[PDB]
Chains A and B, each alone.
With several copies, the nearest count.
Chain A
Amino acid sequence: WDLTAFGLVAEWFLAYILFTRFFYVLGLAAIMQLFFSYFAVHFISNSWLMWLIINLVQMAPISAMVRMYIFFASFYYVWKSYVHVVDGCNSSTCMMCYK
């Protein structure tokens, strides 16, 4: 349905607006979450890194991960804007608005 699905798509689209180097981590986590849903539940015991990764990727649903990434991205961008307000920009040639 519209309201139950369009919101998730809108959140996903808005996530790309606040782009960062950690976006690929969430992108890979989204693939991992779907991959071990129609597959896996196999490969038996032994080792611990693989099981640790499996537990980490299945920690929370995708929407919660997206919202948590959005929170941190918003805080990072706010901090960067605050830094840009006081200290000044490198490109003083354009004169920006602080000069």
Chain B
Amino acid sequence: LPGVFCGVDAVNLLTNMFTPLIQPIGALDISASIVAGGIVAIVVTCLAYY
């Protein structure tokens, strides 16, 4: 279910929070935009500046 996070331990949950990010495209329907933007900003900054 959306908005629900789980993991074996505190660090495990934090690491698993990024699991959908490595999932093949076609896993989210509405919240895809924010996930895309969160990668786009990092990529564009880290490349175009540094």
Task: Categorize the interface residue count of chain A.
Answer: under 10
Q: Does B21 have its Cβ within 8 Å of any Cβ on chain A?
A: no
Q: Does B47 have its Cβ within 8 Å of any Cβ on chain A?
A: no
A42-58 at interface with B (beta carbon < 8 Å): 45, 48, 51-52, 55
Q: Does A1 have its Cβ within 8 Å of any Cβ on chain B?
A: no
The contact of A52 among B30, B34, B35, B38, by CB within 8 Å, is B30
- Against B, the Cβ 8 Å flags (1 = close, 0 = not) of A25-63 are 000000000000000000001001001100100000000
Q: Does B40 have its Cβ within 8 Å of any Cβ on chain A?
A: no
Q: Does A55 contact B30, Cβ atoms closer than 8 Å? A: yes
Q: Does B43 have its Cβ within 8 Å of any Cβ on chain A?
A: no
A residues within 8 Å of B by Cβ? 45, 48, 51-52, 55, 71, 74-75
